[PDB]
Design a protein around this ligand. Sequence first.
Ligand SMILES: Nc1ncnc2c1ncn2[C@@H]1O[C@H](COP(=O)(O)OP(=O)(O)OP(=O)(O)O)[C@@H](O)[C@H]1O
Ligand SMILES: Nc1ncnc2c1ncn2[C@@H]1O[C@H](COP(=O)(O)OP(=O)(O)OP(=O)(O)O)[C@@H](O)[C@H]1O
Ligand SMILES: Nc1ncnc2c1ncn2[C@@H]1O[C@H](COP(=O)(O)OP(=O)(O)OP(=O)(O)O)[C@@H](O)[C@H]1O
Ligand SMILES: CNC(=O)c1cc(Cl)cc(C)c1NC(=O)c1cc(Br)nn1-c1ncccc1Cl
Ligand SMILES: Cn1c(=O)c2c(ncn2C)n(C)c1=O
Ligand SMILES: [Ca+2]
Ligand SMILES: [Zn+2]
Ligand SMILES: [Zn+2]
Ligand SMILES: [Zn+2]
Lengths: 194, 531, 38, 48
Amino acid sequence: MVMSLLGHYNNFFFAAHLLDIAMEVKTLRTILSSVTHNGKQLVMTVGLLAVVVYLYTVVAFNFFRKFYNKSEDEDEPDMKCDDMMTCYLFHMYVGVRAGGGIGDEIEDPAGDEYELYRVVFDITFFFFVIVILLAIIQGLIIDAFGELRDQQEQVKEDMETKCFICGIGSDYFDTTPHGFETHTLEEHNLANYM
Amino acid sequence: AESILEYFRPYLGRIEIMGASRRIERIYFEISETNRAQWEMPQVKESKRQFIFDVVNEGGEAEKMELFVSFCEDTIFEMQIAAQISWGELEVQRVKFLNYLSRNFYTLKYLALFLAFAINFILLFYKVSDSPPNMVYYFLEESTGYMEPALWCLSLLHTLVAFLMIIGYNCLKVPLVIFKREKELARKLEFDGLYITEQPGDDDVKGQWDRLVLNTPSFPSNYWDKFVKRKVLDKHGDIFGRERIAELLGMDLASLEILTWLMSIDVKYQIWKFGVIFTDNSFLYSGWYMVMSLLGHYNNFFFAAHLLDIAMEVKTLRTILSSVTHNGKQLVMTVGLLAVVVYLYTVVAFNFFRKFYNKSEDEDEPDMKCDDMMTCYLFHMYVGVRAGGGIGDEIEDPAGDEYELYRVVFDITFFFFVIVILLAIIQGLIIDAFGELRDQQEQVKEDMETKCFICGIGSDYFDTTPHGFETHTLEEHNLANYMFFLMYLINKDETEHTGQESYVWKMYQERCWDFFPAGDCFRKQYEDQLS
Amino acid sequence: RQFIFDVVNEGGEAEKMELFVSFCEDTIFEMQIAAQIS
Amino acid sequence: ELRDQQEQVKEDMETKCFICGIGSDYFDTTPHGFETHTLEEHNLANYM
Ligand SMILES: Nc1ncnc2c1ncn2[C@@H]1O[C@H](COP(=O)(O)OP(=O)(O)OP(=O)(O)O)[C@@H](O)[C@H]1O
Ligand SMILES: Nc1ncnc2c1ncn2[C@@H]1O[C@H](COP(=O)(O)OP(=O)(O)OP(=O)(O)O)[C@@H](O)[C@H]1O
Ligand SMILES: Nc1ncnc2c1ncn2[C@@H]1O[C@H](COP(=O)(O)OP(=O)(O)OP(=O)(O)O)[C@@H](O)[C@H]1O
Ligand SMILES: CNC(=O)c1cc(Cl)cc(C)c1NC(=O)c1cc(Br)nn1-c1ncccc1Cl
Ligand SMILES: Cn1c(=O)c2c(ncn2C)n(C)c1=O
Ligand SMILES: [Ca+2]
Ligand SMILES: [Zn+2]
Ligand SMILES: [Zn+2]
Ligand SMILES: [Zn+2]
């Protein structure tokens, strides 16, 4: 209701109401439940994916501060490592979102100069931050899925097979023809105990 | 008699042992308030949960029972320590201080964790300058009454707290360590003859660092039986010279004889002891944390190493990272292959496609990254692996004839393998590792939700009567009670032991764990009759 | 359907029965409301 | 898939006998039952 009142102040606020297209139609709710199921894990995963980009920020600084720099004009400034957080930023922006990590937006060791340090650096970066971490993320959700399904199946079976009121199983009730279908539809029915 | 039979409900216990007449019999006894009071504190409760978890999903299924008795024996020690924490004149202050640093050890840990984030937030403001306020570093903030003075001040507090956790660990979590270590030794010598008949056997390094204490005159220090050295002389004392086992167990000549500090110190025991700890994986982590806090005074960016605890033991991070540490040798192994394949490609390219390479533009174009199988190997592990279509995106373009259909095959093969197959396998392993932990956990829980620990009977038989598997698992065969018995009988002054409490005692002192039900239970035995 | 689902895969196994009685007590109220609107 | 197969194998064993087919239950009624009917009586190496 409040967003529908804001829709009269600026009509683009009516775009907020399309978020119901996620709330309770069963295919969208079961899909989004795989993401919600598993929260503190994920919100923590992302947490690590920040303390693992802060450390690649620090190191660089101390040593590789020249191998950086993103300008072209002779009077080249735009030094994204000569100030406070800019690097932490440059590492959470340009970095994380790429293919080979920082190694694709920072000069090129090539010309000697600690060559075998910026190689190690980059390869260690991309490998962790892009395989390991981003991988773990897809990992959690897939599991969360399998998880819901397992619960559901357990439910159904525990039922297809045994009684609610009492606890006897199908066997001791199926020794006779159509048995577990009587001791659960006539005798110990549920609706009737109500 | 309901009032009475209720006031005394928390101070009674029902066991269900089987012995003598080959029949099930019930035992009743009394438990003090303090005996039960030191059981519901959170530290012991979490120990129960962890022990139950790692005995159903590892190699038990027969010898699980002796592990349970071993579980009781160490919680016996644990509860004694907790009771003790709740010139000349300075000794009263020092015992009160050591009891203080160990009484709240987990608050010192949270306070060190908060100071790591407080220092690292202040490090985001640094800045480099071409001249002073070449290569001059400044704290680059508005003066505030903050920044530089607070960065100086917090570096002392983090080092003080990282030092106090060494003392806090050494006076709380190391006693039990040295304990679970003497028992072992004094349990091999007698009922096996370790050094009296066989021999460590090299491989067992542990079983060697510990050939130093045997002779020590305080071997059974943190261990109840200060007589072990005399039960081995009495046993393996004939088949082996009574004057030969009268050495590798100290008691030198004792066979016949059957301020402070600096003044009395078994130099040789202390040595042994020290060794035992510089190898505990929890002590080495605590030592590293302190060392990095000292390096934090040489260059303040070393305090960024302490943010790695944000992975070590908060439960969402630990369960997430545990999916990566499971399947270790697998992963590393995979990468190994991903380095042989990109080599079986280096060898190839070279021989033929060495011109299709080259990464220069100047007329005098050199930068030929294929004039050495070394550089080629790098160019293939650098530019290559990390891309979208593999080498095919950083190496000219077949197009112009020249083996066109060879560099096509090359690239497409390289690509498909190294980027689908391999990188895929990696994500594969971790996901599985996940499913793996969950399965174990579920197994644990269920095996429990459903069956008994002491014996092995299942729910069914029990659930025949209303709420069956909640009594035979909450009264009779309870677990906590098969433990309070021990502590009880240990106090009961012998001469006043009953009949059943003397069958168990003699069976405890001789390690014959056959007094546990295992397979049966009153209800079953006395079925027909009534119970 | 929803009640049956969330009593087998959570912490029942003993006290499930009082939940069932609690289930009946609220559907008792529900049916009374529907009568008052028709 | 491979893991499932492996687990099945192990368990089918941790739990039941090879020569005959009786399970752990009918054997564990007594103390350490199965660990006997699979290490003394119906051992396998011995039928060899
Ligand atoms: N009291 C009971 N005791 C044992 N089993 C029961 C009991 N009530 C239901 N069941 C189990 O659930 C099944 C019957 O559920 P039913 O399909 O009637 O519920 P429903 O989905 O509301 O019905 P409908 O499909 O008509 O909507 C039976 O197979 C039975 O095994
Ligand atoms: N001696 C036993 N024999 C059979 N089952 C047992 C035994 N001890 C515990 N259990 C099983 O474990 C459950 C009781 O565990 P309980 O929850 O009391 O441990 P806890 O988690 O330490 O307790 P709390 O939840 O109060 O911390 C019961 O459902 C029971 O089936
Ligand atoms: N004949 C049998 N009948 C039933 N179970 C058997 C039989 N043989 C082996 N087993 C099962 O396998 C297990 C014994 O296998 P064992 O570990 O001895 O094989 P192994 O791995 O060759 O031995 P080791 O571990 O010494 O190499 C027992 O737990 C038992 O249940
Ligand atoms: C497994 N690491 C350790 O042993 C450890 C060792 C030392 Cl010397 C210092 C700290 C802060 C350590 N880290 C923790 O001890 C810790 C990190 C997180 Br996140 N939570 N957490 C914790 N766990 C329980 C109670 C209080 C806390 Cl603070
Ligand atoms: C003397 N004694 C014992 O005999 C004992 C014990 N714990 C188990 N036993 C058997 N403790 C702590 C003990 O002091
Ligand atoms: Ca007496
Ligand atoms: Zn029924
Ligand atoms: Zn039991
Ligand atoms: Zn058999």
